RNA sequence: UGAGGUAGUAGGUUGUAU
DNA sequence: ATACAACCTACTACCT
């Protein structure tokens, strides 16, 4: 006997200053916010890798349907959505020879054969951005899938062919940072899922149902990286700013550290976006520890502060802190010590980790999306993923979890705190969706945590998405 | 003024949906069948009344499902009667948007026109279009995307939204009805090493710096320490507990934090040695221990006709639940629903990779409504009494076994 | 690593008080 | 260094 309360689905914002609950929708719709002109591509691999993505990239122009237009609405081709060119004739490629894949891969260290294979693409991608006339938006890396599959963390090579992270995207990505280059990392089973098959004869990877949504999470992304506006919210608050905290381990350190990383969302005076990387991930030395020093933590606040205040000129409000985990008496009186009497700071626990599944008695489908349970003023339960009336299935697989949102220092109504974080579910510019269960600044904030942390060092590194996502 | 747009009806939606909405966003009146989530009594002769009075272009959709469909035929004739009355050459502007009816397969009605090319881009066909519009002057107002907008959230949302409804869902929470009147500390001393195993008595039992936590009775112990029998009740801190889950106990003693964990930890314990009583097979995972039922133990696997056990491809699968208690934010069992995996009816696999593997293969046709009705027939069948079961705790708790509802104002239309 | 979701497996920390 | 509860991350495998 318990009373659920229900909040209303967010708004994003297209074209024409015309609002959609769906980015698809919208997207194909209205259009995007940004006006760019096309999308010159560089692509590196094998001579198989650039035919595969030549086929891909024509292929994209087309429309492509789901099984179900209604569940999963179908891609009407890049350039009637995004109204901008993005082609196989603005291909630049560079070659990436099968013998220099070979003479790297087999190795018995994992960590040797990763350093090597990162290198070998990346100094190729280094020197045609340094040495080369033609100027590219994202550089496509079509790695073959043995690689994948050789070069994860836990990867074992089998005996019969036989600092920085074990792991190829996250090295690949770190140790393109100085140079600042959007690049998108394809599989070469991803874009040709058709020739992959397996011993019975069938792909390994069946896109036959979801070809067009495949084609539309790729066309965002690309469209993101090359330096597009999708989509952006509506109907939020100004002088707010929403923070992002996430820890992560370094393992690359002789001493394991935890560097706590974040992500910045507001608004500007030109009634736009910012949503960008606040990070020089700051280092816990105590090992299994996730509080920051109150050093680090003045740091962390002034930085956030100053780059408000340089974007607007005025102190905000209000301030958020969204975190998965619980801020102590240490970290909180260190961050009361910078912020100004005018501003409020009010830090919140986001988890996943209370098992409260709610079963809905009167069919097969699962509870509604949006429906909260109001534990008390400062505990709440919210549904951010489950059955979605627009496309008529829900974003789980079996029963969705609940997202257990507690406002754990300061104060705010926390029904204000649930409308924050389901409008912010709306901001995943990695895919092409509804809206996903994790707000989008810790969802980020832990992308750009996972970078920053599979390197030994590096310098102030950029604050833009489209660098890391 | 108006745009006819030509097509068949359930095979063309969706570039038809798309133009449509395209060129209202434009500032072009369009008449499409499917703009029209109501349709009236008279179809066929308010169609003909609008090709012969009121549209100044006829759009055909030309596709492998549009070249002899009937309607579409007729409208094509009626549409070039009325090309006929008002001279007007170019009245008729097919468009070719299917890959698999070739150029040459096209109808006589329109195999002798100028043909707009979809099939490569879409985006190059509409701006064909509106380039022809624009050099033919076909009228058109100024462009307003409000206009789509608004046709949109008509016509192909409005059964696609949530309604006002009065819903009731169960949950995984069992409330803890009733209470032991108060908690006891037995200052035991000594007791021969305070009964080292402590996990391993009846009774649910912890040590504290010199006292044993526990709900029963001091004597109950004497049938695993000896010397129990001669210790006295005097030594005895009553606590009431009722006054506990309210936070009301102060002082350097014990705090009311460490009493609700010590609860919890007694709670967990009696609930483990209660279902080791009840005769259930026990799995351990990572963190945590489940509780599941073999092959032939149920008559036929059926208890209230909901199915416990099952046969998935050569391995038997048993439905398991693990459990907790907590006080945050009421006394609550919290209880999750597991998958486990024999080879035989009474039997276990090793691997856990191929359990995982096993589990994620089932998981992905079962749904909420077997989820639930599994769930409560392993809550019901672990019951007691009507509507309750106890845990042995002389004292005892009951935990309910019917899950805590909660209720809902709103809901959708399946 | 197109992307989410659901699970499982390891490890560690914290006021305790043996 | 044991037991417990209460919070934390890293790393896979599978479905759509
Ligand atoms: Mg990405």
């Given at each position: 006997?318990?009373?659920?309360?229900?909040?209303?689905?967010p708004?994003?914002?297209?074209?024409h200053?015309?609002?959609?609950?769906?980015?698809?929708?919208?997207?194909?719709?209205?259009?995007?916010?940004?006006?760019?002109?096309?999308?010159?591509?560089?692509?590196?691999?094998?001579?198989?890798?650039?035919?595969?993505?030549?086929?891909?990239?024509?292929?994209?122009?087309?429309?492509?349907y789901?099984?179900?237009?209604?569940?999963?609405?179908?891609?009407?081709?890049?350039?009637?959505?995004?109204?901008?060119?993005?082609?196989?004739?603005?291909?630049?490629?560079?070659?990436?020879?099968?013998?220099?894949?070979?003479?790297?891969?087999?190795?018995?260290?994992?960590?040797?054969?990763?350093?090597?294979?990162?290198?070998?693409?990346?100094?190729?991608?280094?020197?045609?951005?340094?040495?080369?006339?033609?100027?590219?938006?994202?550089?496509?890396?079509?790695?073959?899938?043995?690689?994948?599959?050789?070069?994860?963390?836990?990867?074992?090579?089998?005996?019969?062919?036989?600092?920085?992270?074990?792991?190829?995207?996250?090295?690949?990505?770190?140790?393109?940072?100085?140079?600042?280059?959007?690049?998108?990392?394809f599989?070469?089973?991803?874009?040709?899922?058709?020739?992959?098959?397996?011993?019975?004869?069938?792909?390994?990877?069946?896109?036959?149902?979801?070809?067009?949504?495949?084609?539309?999470?790729?066309?965002?992304?690309?469209?993101?990286?090359?330096?597009?506006?999708?989509?952006?919210?509506?109907?939020?608050?100004?002088?707010?700013?929403?923070?992002?905290?996430?820890?992560?381990?370094?393992?690359k350190?002789?001493?394991?550290?935890?560097?706590?990383?974040?992500?910045?969302?507001?608004?500007?005076?030109?009634?736009?976006?910012?949503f960008?990387?606040?990070?020089?991930?700051?280092?816990?030395?105590?090992?299994?520890?996730?509080?920051?020093?109150?050093?680090?933590?003045?740091?962390?606040?002034?930085?956030?502060?100053?780059?408000?205040?340089?974007?607007?000129?005025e102190?905000?409000?209000?301030?958020?802190?969204?975190?998965?985990?619980?801020?102590?008496?240490?970290?909180?009186?260190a961050?009361?010590?910078?912020?100004?009497?005018e501003?409020?700071?009010?830090?919140?626990?986001?988890?996943?980790?209370?098992?409260?599944?709610?079963?809905?008695?009167?069919?097969?489908?699962?509870?509604?999306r949006?429906?909260?349970?109001?534990?008390?003023?400062?505990?709440?339960?919210?549904?951010?993923?489950?059955?979605?009336?627009?496309?008529?299935?829900?974003?789980?697989?079996?029963?969705?979890?609940?997202?257990?949102?507690?406002?754990?220092?300061?104060?705010?109504?926390?029904?204000?705190?649930?409308?924050?974080?389901l409008?912010?579910?709306?901001?995943?510019?990695?895919?092409?969706?509804?809206?996903?269960?994790?707000?989008?600044?810790?969802?980020?904030?832990?992308?750009?945590?996972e970078?920053?942390?599979?390197?030994?060092?590096?310098?102030?590194?950029?604050?833009?998405?489209?660098y890391?996502? | 003024?108006?745009?006819?747009?030509?097509?068949?009806?359930?095979?063309?939606?969706?570039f038809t949906?798309?133009?449509?909405?395209?060129?209202?966003?434009?500032?072009?009146?369009?008449?499409?069948?499917?703009?029209?989530?109501?349709?009236?009594?008279?179809?066929?002769?308010?169609?003909?009344?609008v090709?012969?009075?009121?549209?100044?272009?006829?759009?055909?959709?030309?596709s492998?499902?549009?070249?002899?469909?009937?309607?579409?035929?007729?409208?094509?004739?009626?549409?070039?009667?009325?090309?006929?009355?008002?001279?007007?050459?170019?009245?008729?502007?097919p468009?070719?948007?299917?890959?698999?009816?070739?150029?040459?397969?096209?109808?006589?009605?329109?195999?002798?026109?100028?043909?707009?090319?979809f099939?490569?881009?879409?985006?190059?066909?509409?701006?064909?279009?509106?380039?022809?519009?624009?050099?033919?002057?076909?009228?058109?107002?100024?462009?307003?995307?409000?206009?789509?907008?608004?046709?949109?959230?008509?016509?192909?949302?409005?059964?696609?939204?949530?309604?006002?409804?009065?819903?009731?869902?169960?949950?995984?929470?069992?409330?803890?009805?009733?209470?032991?009147?108060?908690?006891?500390?037995?200052e035991?001393?000594?007791?021969?090493?305070?009964?080292?195993?402590?996990?391993?008595?009846?009774?649910?039992?912890?040590?504290?710096?010199?006292?044993?936590?526990?709900?029963?009775?001091?004597?109950?112990?004497?049938?695993?320490?000896?010397?129990?029998?001669?210790?006295?009740?005097?030594?005895?801190i009553?606590?009431?507990?009722?006054?506990?889950?309210?936070?009301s106990?102060?002082?350097?003693?014990?705090?009311?934090?460490?009493?609700?964990?010590?609860?919890?930890?007694?709670?967990?314990?009696?609930?483990?040695?209660?279902?080791?009583?009840?005769?259930?097979?026990?799995?351990?995972?990572?963190?945590?221990?489940?509780?599941?039922?073999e092959?032939?133990?149920?008559?036929?696997?059926?208890?209230?006709?909901?199915?416990?056990?099952?046969?998935?491809?050569?391995?038997?699968?048993?439905?398991?639940?693990?459990?907790?208690?907590?006080?945050?934010?009421?006394?609550?069992?919290?209880?999750?629903?597991?998958?486990?995996?024999?080879?035989?009816?009474?039997?276990?696999?090793?691997?856990?990779?191929?359990?995982?593997?096993?589990?994620?293969?089932q998981?992905?046709?079962?749904?909420?409504?077997?989820?639930?009705?599994?769930?409560?027939?392993?809550?019901?069948?672990?019951?007691?009494?009507?509507?309750?079961?106890?845990?042995?705790?002389?004292?005892?708790?009951?935990?309910?076994?019917?899950?805590?509802?909660?209720?809902?104002?709103?809901?959708?239309?399946?």
């Amino acid at each position: 006997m318990k009373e659920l309360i229900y909040i209303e689905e967010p708004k994003i914002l297209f074209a024409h200053g015309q609002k959609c609950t769906d980015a698809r929708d919208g997207l194909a719709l209205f259009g995007p916010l940004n006006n760019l002109y096309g999308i010159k591509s560089g692509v590196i691999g094998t001579k198989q890798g650039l035919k595969i993505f030549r086929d891909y990239l024509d292929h994209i122009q087309k429309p492509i349907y789901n099984s179900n237009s209604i569940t999963r609405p179908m891609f009407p081709g890049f350039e009637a959505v995004f109204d901008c060119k993005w082609e196989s004739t603005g291909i630049t490629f560079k070659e990436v020879t099968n013998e220099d894949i070979g003479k790297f891969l087999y190795n018995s260290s994992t960590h040797k054969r990763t350093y090597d294979l990162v290198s070998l693409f990346i100094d190729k991608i280094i020197s045609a951005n340094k040495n080369e006339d033609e100027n590219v938006d994202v550089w496509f890396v079509i790695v073959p899938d043995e690689i994948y599959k050789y070069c994860r963390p836990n990867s074992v090579l089998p005996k019969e062919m036989v600092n920085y992270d074990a792991q190829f995207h996250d090295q690949f990505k770190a140790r393109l940072l100085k140079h600042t280059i959007p690049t998108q990392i394809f599989r070469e089973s991803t874009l040709a899922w058709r020739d992959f098959k397996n011993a019975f004869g069938l792909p390994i990877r069946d896109f036959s149902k979801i070809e067009g949504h495949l084609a539309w999470t790729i066309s965002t992304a690309a469209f993101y990286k090359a330096g597009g506006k999708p989509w952006k919210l509506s109907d939020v608050r100004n002088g707010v700013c929403y923070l992002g905290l996430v820890y992560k381990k370094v393992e690359k350190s002789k001493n394991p550290r935890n560097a706590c990383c974040a992500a910045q969302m507001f608004l500007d005076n030109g009634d736009g976006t910012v949503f960008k990387g606040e990070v020089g991930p700051w280092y816990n030395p105590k090992n299994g520890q996730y509080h920051l020093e109150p050093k680090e933590a003045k740091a962390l606040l002034s930085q956030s502060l100053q780059s408000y205040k340089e974007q607007i000129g005025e102190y905000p409000k209000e301030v958020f802190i969204h975190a998965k985990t619980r801020f102590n008496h240490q970290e909180w009186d260190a961050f009361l010590e910078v912020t100004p009497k005018e501003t409020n700071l009010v830090g919140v626990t986001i988890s996943k980790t209370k098992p409260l599944k709610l079963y809905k008695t009167e069919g097969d489908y699962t509870i509604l999306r949006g429906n909260a349970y109001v534990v008390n003023e400062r505990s709440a339960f919210l549904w951010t993923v489950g059955y979605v009336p627009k496309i008529q299935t829900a974003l789980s697989m079996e029963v969705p979890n609940p997202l257990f949102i507690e406002i754990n220092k300061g104060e705010a109504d926390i029904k204000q705190v649930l409308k924050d974080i389901l409008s912010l579910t709306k901001l995943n510019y990695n895919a092409c969706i509804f809206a996903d269960g994790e707000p989008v600044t810790l969802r980020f904030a832990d992308k750009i945590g996972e970078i920053l942390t599979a390197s030994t060092d590096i310098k102030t590194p950029p604050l833009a998405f489209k660098y890391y996502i | 003024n108006k745009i006819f747009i030509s097509h068949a009806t359930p095979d063309d939606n969706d570039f038809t949906r798309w133009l449509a909405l395209k060129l209202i966003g434009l500032g072009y009146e369009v008449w499409c069948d499917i703009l029209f989530l109501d349709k009236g009594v008279d179809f066929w002769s308010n169609i003909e009344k609008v090709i012969r009075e009121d549209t100044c272009k006829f759009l055909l959709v030309s596709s492998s499902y549009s070249n002899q469909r009937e309607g579409v035929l007729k409208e094509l004739a009626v549409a070039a009667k009325v090309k006929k009355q008002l001279k007007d050459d170019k009245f008729i502007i097919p468009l070719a948007i299917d890959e698999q009816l070739s150029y040459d397969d096209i109808n006589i009605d329109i195999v002798r026109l100028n043909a707009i090319d979809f099939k490569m881009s879409w985006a190059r066909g509409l701006k064909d279009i509106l380039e022809a519009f624009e050099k033919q002057k076909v009228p058109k107002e100024v462009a307003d995307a409000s206009k789509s907008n608004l046709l949109y959230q008509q016509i192909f949302l409005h059964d696609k939204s949530v309604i006002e409804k009065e819903e009731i869902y169960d949950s995984n929470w069992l409330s803890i009805l009733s209470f032991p009147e108060e908690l006891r500390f037995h200052e035991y001393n000594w007791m021969l090493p305070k009964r080292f195993d402590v996990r391993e008595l009846t009774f649910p039992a912890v040590r504290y710096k010199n006292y044993l936590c526990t709900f029963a009775w001091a004597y109950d112990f004497t049938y695993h320490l000896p010397k129990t029998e001669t210790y006295h009740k005097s030594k005895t801190i009553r606590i009431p507990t009722e006054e506990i889950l309210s936070g009301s106990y102060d002082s350097n003693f014990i705090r009311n934090a460490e009493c609700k964990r010590l609860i919890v930890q007694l709670l967990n314990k009696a609930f483990e040695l209660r279902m080791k009583d009840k005769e259930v097979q026990e799995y351990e995972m990572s963190n945590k221990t489940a509780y599941w039922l073999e092959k032939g133990k149920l008559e036929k696997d059926k208890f209230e006709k909901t199915m416990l056990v099952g046969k998935q491809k050569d391995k038997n699968w048993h439905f398991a639940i693990s459990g907790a208690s907590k006080l945050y934010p009421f006394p609550v069992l919290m209880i999750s629903s597991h998958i486990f995996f024999t080879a035989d009816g009474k039997k276990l696999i090793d691997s856990s990779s191929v359990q995982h593997s096993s589990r994620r293969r089932q998981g992905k046709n079962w749904w909420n409504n077997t989820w639930r009705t599994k769930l409560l027939a392993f809550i019901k069948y672990l019951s007691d009494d009507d509507t309750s079961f106890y845990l042995e705790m002389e004292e005892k708790v009951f935990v309910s076994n019917e899950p805590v509802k909660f209720k809902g104002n709103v809901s959708y239309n399946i």
